[PDB]
Symmetry: D2
């Protein structure tokens, strides 16, 4: 029964994400928004034999109509990286995009869950919060930075190394979504896994620089699109399940947090009807994992402040 | 346990198709092929938390290694339409692509199920058959023209007009995949539906021109990609289920046929372990539907002859 | 003192063509039209330090304002070929595009010179003629099928083989613009050149299939764009010089002709203030060249009929 | 006559640039390089009826053959901006592209004039210089950051305000190529123009934001391509004229400079047979202009160091 808007639906992530949402029995209305090509994408998907009604919207004059009555908004809108770039190279362009779109959300569907994919997530979530505070509708239990792909990657890499089935593996990943701020808690992995430190370190780095590995492999043709569509769909489904009374639903996500001195931080969250039911916190961790958390905090706070300062100039 | 090859994996269809395939526990190995961009696509999908081992292959030199050991090969490789073009206007270009790709298949995975998505399907399937014949490995039970999107469109459109869930609608569509050769048997629809003749004609025209509807809506940005990825994934899943011994798997598909004077024709096929188990035939049809079959045959024969003639000059 | 419109200005040919026109002191006003990207292209071109004022127009609502007061219209709007395509595969698409765009010309700038680049020229010139008839403003001295690239190619190749400066070479090319209908009158070449019949035949084939060789070299990335921009700029410059009263300006172009049983035909044309001042005809030719003319006529008639037929259907 | 290499010849700037170079009687040989599409672009251009011999090169193995014997190398290779990006946001991607390509030039055509178009120019010229130093062939009189488009824009905008022929306007533009580092010296314009202050300020700002204006207008489809092709060609032609012994050839360009405290800086340069004959300096400026120089210096030094540092960490 959920009504989901996808802002940036014509892009690399947007189209396959919209596909996965259209294919879901959980979605009864799918509104697609972009600045280009949205009508053709909507017609394409409207032919698929599922109940979700698909409507496409094009340009800022139609963004309000796209947002009317939505339960979840997902925002893959933004520019992807080229080889060599950092996520902060995209900050200027994507901060404007995220601020503009989340402003419309605050105006026209303030009650909706806001799921931000656009990078750098470590800054774009603070931006979303400060835009919502600006319109006086800020609810910290309903704004999510989608880090799900870090968890998905962690599970895959663990499963390959130990010959396990990825569907059975679960690795909490905490901190943020950029380089050393991505902290995989291999010591909390279910099932339990033992690696020597050199292999643990190699696995940790692989997970951290996984996005960059894909940017290099694509050689100028963009960043992770299909896996991020999978990761975004997964997160939305988790959130909607929880919204229909499903219990025990847990997903890591970068949110407003009091667990560390960072005002925003990613930890496992129990999800409920009002978004975040309970922040489950960092929990018990190794020395190696404590070192990474401690090392990640300055970069996190700098990014958090960079997003806040950007909204301050609006 | 099914090893699936996608030829044309970097395209508008190939990428979301490859995603849907990667997401399924029916696929144990997903080998992707194209003339550009495949390594990045493979890198992207390899991070998804499912069992399928994803490998990428690039250029004619690597095509044999993409195909070896394959159970299924799907071929979305081909040029799509621009507004104003017929599917037949693509023949010359796409003919050479299908012939070359299917020759490698006949040489390197002759036992595999061959699923051609490339247009015009009415001519490209005959090209595939003649190519396989030329190499002495022609099995008419394993060569499939993917017409599934026509069925998906029919189901959806009927479901919309009757207020039904399209997940529990099934309209057999027969003939071929081009204009008037697309024949939806609404008389055989489950559940039973009865339209007056004025509406039935419009519904029938809508289904026939659905592909062109998406072409115009995309205004030169290509044809159906996401819905075709859906339809193609469904057909492969149906085919892989049947190969795993699942019973009652029925799909319409343009295949080597003796149901009419046409050498190739689409009807509901019972699929099994060896490919086509039994052609379920045209069945009991209305006068209206009987006229369309009669009207379609000359065009289908021409399209078939065109395809056969192309291989004759190789 | 000439106001020129480019219809299809955002395309592969359109952009470099518009650039060459912008650079010319013959052009005082340049209006650019497309269905996509025009404002960005016009903004880019308007920064160049030449006198021509540039303005961009997007979509059919802005087409009339583009054409008002136009002295010359050049029409590269259309779909180019992929490898394997015949020029007739693009007929249905381009015929529609040419018909639409020439109707607006007929209504809004009926006295303007109409230079059609869009293929197949052998049919799109007939289409342009009939559309102009419907609106009661047909003038056959102002409608030009741009075949200049063929002449340009012929000059380059003859110069290459003979070690000449291509600026000092002129080869009349007659007939039409497709395959064997492209007839280089090497016997009329200035300066005089002497080839054995074997070299002459291969050279003649090279000229006829030149467009195809470029399509092959681009491997799906399109057809001749930069060389066509050059050729189209040359023809437009020739025409605008003649319109300003320059004498002895001669260009081959595909036009309304009584030189043969074909109703449209390309021969060298004396241009002047009314457009076509005098058709210079075929002249004396070799037996070899007479043979090619004879063989080409059936193709030309067919192509002329096809375009004329298409217009009746609107 | 001049042998000119274009690195990044298949791009938006590279292709039209290559066309302008091909059309010019000052070019005897045109060698084109890119990582994709080069052979198609070269085949296309090789049909144009000018004397310049055109050859296309593709991939690292063929780069040296492209550079051998070159008098001038133009390097448009690089990633363009999207809306909201600064030129500096392209640094991390384009630093490696410029470093590689200029290392190739240092090896294979060290005596050639090196014209860097790739952004950010304020940092990529220092990169170029440091790469030539590493190779022991650094000649500061032959390394040029192409700022010519800023001058072209200034000439055009001044001519539009005053109602002049832009062919007769020359505005020196100094400093660098980004935002407030672009300093148009309207007080040194020929002919002398007197502007009311409100127009002068809006003019100055227009010149500085012109690049961003075009990026905005292209709405994600790149940056200035056609006007940059015009400007880069103009610069090459001035360079070749001066190489052929023409006197009084002056062009502004971002070069090694001892005019301010910035080690690199753009001023009018008298060009001669060996590149820079003489840096003509800042000359006499107004207070308004002196202040713009003062404000620009901190940003220039920062962009310079950024470029130098990049090379020292290799
Ligand atoms: N959170 C993650 O783990 C994660 C992973 C991968 C990528 N990303 C980010 O997702 C974003 C999108 O990546 P992509 O590959 O889809 O890029 P893309 O260029 O393929 O698509 C971007 C889409 O956003 C649209 N867009 C741009 N401005 C818009 C606006 N103002 N309003 C509405 N739509 C607008 C574009 O038109 C395009 O359709 C990037 O910022 C990328 O860095 C995040
Ligand atoms: N059966 C149907 O109902 C149906 C529906 C939609 C589209 N189609 C057809 O599917 C085909 C693909 O459509 P699309 O939208 O993905 O086009 P696309 O242009 O987006 O991608 C097609 C892909 O084919 C690849 N390709 C071309 N030649 C190749 C070769 N020789 N070897 C390997 N790869 C090659 C291209 O690189 C490209 O990645 C088209 O022919 C279209 O007509 C069929
Ligand atoms: N005369 C010749 O010798 C010759 C040579 C080469 C190419 N051509 C023809 O040139 C034409 C285009 O070539 P290209 O390489 O520029 O193709 P392209 O695809 O690069 O550009 C085509 C442009 O036409 C535009 N367009 C399409 N429909 C339009 C419409 N209805 N109104 C306005 N604009 C429209 C598109 O938006 C695009 O910008 C083709 O038809 C090709 O066959 C002719
Ligand atoms: N100096 C100026 O005023 C000015 C003006 C406009 C643009 N620019 C800069 O020029 C570049 C814009 O170029 P464009 O608009 O043609 O972009 P584009 O994307 O259209 O083309 C860039 C070209 O770079 C090529 N390339 C990338 N890496 C390469 C490599 N390693 N070796 C050889 N070629 C490589 C690509 O293949 C492509 O052909 C950007 O750096 C942009 O910032 C400068």
């Amino acid at each position: 029964n959920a009504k989901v808007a996808v802002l940036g639906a014509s892009g690399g992530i947007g189209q396959p994400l919209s596909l996965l949402l259209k294919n879901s029995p959980l979605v009864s209305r799918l509104t697609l928004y972009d600045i280009a090509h949205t009508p053709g994408v909507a017609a394409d998907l409207s032919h698929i034999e599922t109940k979700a009604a698909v409507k496409g919207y094009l340009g800022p004059e139609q963004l309000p109509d796209c947002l009317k009555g939505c339960d979840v908004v997902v925002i893959p809108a933004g520019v992807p990286r080229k080889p060599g770039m950092t996520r902060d190279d995209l900050f200027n362009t994507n901060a404007t995009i995220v601020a503009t779109l989340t402003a419309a959300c605050a105006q026209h569907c303030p009650e909706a869950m806001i799921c931000v994919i656009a990078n750098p997530v470590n800054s774009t979530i603070p931006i979303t919060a400060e835009v919502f505070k600006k319109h006086g509708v800020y609810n910290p239990n309903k704004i999510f930075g989608v880090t799900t792909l870090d968890i998905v990657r962690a599970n895959t890499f663990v499963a390959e190394l130990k010959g396990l089935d990825p569907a059975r593996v679960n690795v909490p990943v905490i901190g943020g979504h950029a380089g050393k701020t991505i902290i995989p808690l291999i010591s909390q992995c279910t099932p339990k896994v033992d690696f020597p430190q050199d292999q643990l370190t190699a696995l940790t780095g692989r997970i951290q620089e996984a996005g960059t590995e894909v940017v290099k492999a694509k050689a100028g043709a963009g960043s992770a699109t299909l896996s991020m569509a999978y990761a975004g769909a997964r997160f939305v489904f988790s959130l909607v399940d929880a919204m229909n009374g499903k219990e025990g639903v847990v997903e890591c996500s970068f949110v407003k947090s009091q667990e560390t001195e960072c005002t925003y931080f990613s930890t496992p969250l129990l999800l409920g009807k009002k978004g975040i039911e309970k922040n489950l916190g960092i929990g018990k961790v190794s020395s190696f994992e404590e070192k990474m958390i401690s090392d990640a905090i300055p970069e996190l706070k700098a990014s958090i402040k960079k997003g806040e300062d950007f909204v301050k100039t609006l």
